[PDB]
Assembly symmetry: T
Homo-oligomer: 135 residues x 12
């Protein structure tokens, strides 16, 4: 399948998951140090163990969208629609803090659902599908 595809003035992205190394993002360790403090890493062992994977995965998904979108000539505010899949909606507050770092001005249109699982296995906690309006 195609990372993104252009159709008229719209760009459709595939659903994107937190993978790089072939690994699945699973904690702060997987992300650049400046970003950690930016996601809210506290330095406390137990707090970072819990919040870390969701924060890291959410960042990785959102940054991959930003890169994929740019590599087609757009910026984050060209994204009209987000469809967001979770294994656990109680993770939403964590996702929402990260999404704030990518949409500081006008937020995209949003669909948010809890599903069972996504590819390639159950450790994926978040998948985002993006739609871009860029003539």
């Amino acid at each position: 399948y195609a990372a993104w595809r252009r159709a008229g003035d719209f760009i459709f992205l595939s659903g994107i998951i937190p993978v790089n190394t072939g690994t699945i993002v699973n904690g702060f360790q997987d992300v650049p140090e400046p970003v950690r403090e930016l996601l809210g890493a506290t330095g406390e062992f137990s707090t970072d163990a819990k919040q870390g994977p969701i924060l890291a995965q959410s960042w990785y998904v959102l940054e991959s969208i930003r890169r994929t979108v740019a590599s087609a000539g757009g910026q984050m505010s060209d994204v009209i629609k987000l469809v967001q899949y979770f294994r656990n909606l109680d993770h939403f507050p964590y996702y929402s803090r990260v999404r704030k770092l990518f949409y500081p001005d006008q937020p995209p249109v949003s669909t948010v659902v809890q599903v069972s699982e996504m590819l390639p296995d159950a450790t994926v906690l978040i998948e985002v599908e993006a739609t871009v309006w860029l003539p």
Copy 2:
């Protein structure tokens, strides 16, 4: 809430929440005239079981109508609905309510059962709308 991109309008998934802060959960949360319309029965056991979903569905569809009115269109300009359920057994109720808003020809439709929607498990139905309005 909504956004224009060329001739299309895209809506956020709408959930049956009062914008009371509360989740709609029964005939009492909808105006008297419409209860009769959703198929309210009067009898207590029946309306206890059907009322949450009918009310929730109507709430969501009407929210969609109004948002589309406030953008220039009516319901027939809604061409694609993505519809999320906690329980597909509710679908017959939902399809009854939707036939109220599309009496002629329905839109393109997607229907899946998912686990939960925001903001909690009492929400039985979410609809995401796509409008074509040049």
Copy 3:
């Protein structure tokens, strides 16, 4: 409504594997023509086929429904730019993906894949695909 044109795009209702002439859910290799069975990967061994037949046959009906729906409107698989694909069991993905390759020889679509609980009309539907077409 099974499809609707808006501008350059055509939108398809989500498609499930229904035997459109018996009103029942496709359930195995018996629901597909003999030479298509070889194509889907049928092996001839009772148990292998009992196990793969449902997802493979269901995947064929969905994708071939999409192909025919698009063919009839003048378009092609390469015009079907986007697929949203709902599974009851992601373990069926390799099977589904073997079939999807058959339908997209040159221009693969953009893809989203999730496991949900269930689809219409009941729990024996294993795969559902929502297709989006760009055809000026």
Copy 4:
């Protein structure tokens, strides 16, 4: 024993939805005559009907079995004073209750309704009704 008179009362065995001429469990609108389908609320839409058909058809077979059993003994639905009604899923109640209204136009019976785990012969039976008749 499907029924037994004791004094003024007649007692019926609990009744399940069995196709009495094929020995199988009623499973949808196909098991009922076409004009009765409209009466039960069939809509013509594939998925709505797939979902309501079983409980509605099962409810019809049970209630119509009771009606016929009572008719044959000289009585009427108004003589069927008491019903005990067992469900696998109380969410089916609105459907069942739509059908029960059909059988009781003037004198509704006394009613008990519970969700139990299961009934004979297997888990596809959705509804079972025990009827009690007063007929001097």
Copy 5:
């Protein structure tokens, strides 16, 4: 359906559940204060939170039977048969304390089973079906 129906010398009642206001009885608060002390309310927060709903629901069901029966010209000792449905038989001791307040002399015939659910939803913990012998 019919609250009760007369057939010869017998009166059949419908199964009765704890509803009034359209609410489902769910604690001591739903019952008259003299009755609370009578059901065994302790005044302790945690004890009353647990015992309360079952005690209150049981009383409400039994009193509705007493009223329905009287409104047909009988008293509690005219009830021959009780069929009693529970979501949880571990609630039986609570039910049994209340039933003692309605049958102090000779107890009716009894059938007692745990079922899954009753109408109109899962918060109903007790439903009683009564049969009356009253020529």
Copy 6:
């Protein structure tokens, strides 16, 4: 236990408990002659699986017989049985035992699977009897 109301006698639901204080749970809790009758097999695995329900069923039915004798009737005056099971898979065993007490024509019958009966989960079968004895 039982009560007269006109020509009918009504019985409390009977459970398979010794009136030892204990729940009957196997062939050992029933007299030697009847074991052969319930279909006891001699082999250990089989009788371990069938014995609880056969014994329990027999215990309950016999309790019903005696209560009906102590009121003037025999089994044929029992016209309606309501029968509660923890597991309908047990029904075939139960139906075998019941055919012992109604060799000719069975009574009017209701059969459901419920969750539990008193006084705990080891009780597999409860029967409520209704007698017609003018």
Copy 7:
């Protein structure tokens, strides 16, 4: 390979209850000849038979498959020295054991019996038996 001789022993593949001429899983008394039904313990009562029929019929097909497989190689049930027997529900054991008695009138085999989760081709197979034969 359904069987293989090595020296004096013949080894059988595990055997499941498949209707070998319709490719489907045996499911009740209807899958067995009428006089064999009496032998298996059919009672004529709808619900008793609905409940015992599957395990009894499945047990007959498995054991009779073994008998025929062994008969065709010159041997007998007394030559079938060892059985490994897999169940989905050990509560079916008394039924299975009633049928196994039929096949072993003089020299019963050595026996292992376990409850596992599942067998091929799907979850409706209730019983599977692996047989080992000593036939010089």
Copy 8:
């Protein structure tokens, strides 16, 4: 139950849960706490986020503040509470509780036990229960 009890230089609290001593209400979200305490627990103003984080934040705060007020009614301050035993229905809630606990121990935190149990009184909607021990000569 005794709210607290002295024994030598020690004061032992009963395990505390987020219930109104008045209403008898279980604390269920932001609406049950002082307005500026909300943005102090990290409320965002977003409906869905606040619905998800509200209950654990509110209950934690309510419990921790109870401890404070109780400790006050015996002469001591938050910093004399040296031991906490903290019981959760769901340890995924820990980061939320930890945010709140920092607000009460800005300087040096107490000794700490944290376990996930099945349930606390009076029902399953109670997400956190803390037991406090005080050293106060």
Copy 9:
């Protein structure tokens, strides 16, 4: 394990469960307690009620009385037990335990923690386990 232990003015008990130190029996109902203690726990004489309430009442009593007897073997009385930690398999059992606890603290009750856990030693039939702390100069 040490039944109890002194440390300054304090005596700490091991968590106690309803087992016979003799038989090795787990207490399972009324039949395991002194006859007049039965109607003192609220036995009704009804078979089914007593089967349902018997085990929690009997186990609670057995545990609480153990505490008493232990506390006695060190010179103290029930009223010097100032802290209890109480562990349940099922908090729906709380009203039963609370009835019993009143019988041991008729005057002023102790400091109290109550949680529902999954299991206690030696098996799942143990419904209640109490841990006691004593102040006794």
Copy 10:
């Protein structure tokens, strides 16, 4: 069925479970006192309650094999093959300590699986099927 059967130079045993008195072995109490210390009984109440049933059942199964095998003229080292069924593989360390008492020299060939249940009910934790090579 047949406790064991001879076929050429091989002896097949039936799967064997811990039964005597018709009871199912369920603790140290069911086994001879010298053996208890030999299985690792500590004397501590809680330890013996947990380890006891698996240790006792494993011993009973293995000793019954030794007796059945001897009663056909062989010794434990005539057993070539063990097939071992468990309700819970976390019991394996306990089984393995006991098996060491029966195979001190060369261990038999081994198949080990967790199954759901065995005959006659769920309290059986171990069943062993043995195969003997004894011309």
Copy 11:
């Protein structure tokens, strides 16, 4: 590991463990040439799902081959396989791998789904082999 008894050789149940101390769990734990052979696809989602079982199956079968070589035979001397799965849905993958080791005529076969094998739940397949080698 194995034992001779007359003309037969009996093998211990083999599990897919490296003798690294680790459980094999994906294509990466098998040599490049064989990945192509097991049906490795290159695409990431597919190979993530098929790779554990194919790798595990191949690991187990090859272990069997080598053990049989180190005793004088080849694969065709393996006449009976007992095959244990955590999930029978894996069987098609397993049957593909096994067809690699028995290209002509398969051996006598037993296939059940069990709960777990040693040493933990990540092991998806265990095979017990019986060899006939005079």
Copy 12:
């Protein structure tokens, strides 16, 4: 969190879990403990047995030894730890823990509470967590 804390003659430890203060690793089997400590926990050398017993033995040892080392950093020895509260995910693991605890209290064991809870920090792979109280004048 404070590792330990003094209050009068008492020292209270935070509940301890089997994590490396260095790596941040959760202890998962024999490979995480000193080699001769393995056969001291009862390692057999068998692959399958050691895989099954390794994690509980290793985690118990790691936790108990932490307690020791901590107690040392305040001047006391294992025998001044008079109270332990021990939390398990699975009490079937108790015999393993008990073996290990004997190695630290060869003479007279401490006061003891043992319960099965659902989970401990930081995740579900933690099988045992012990809380220690010390008397040390």
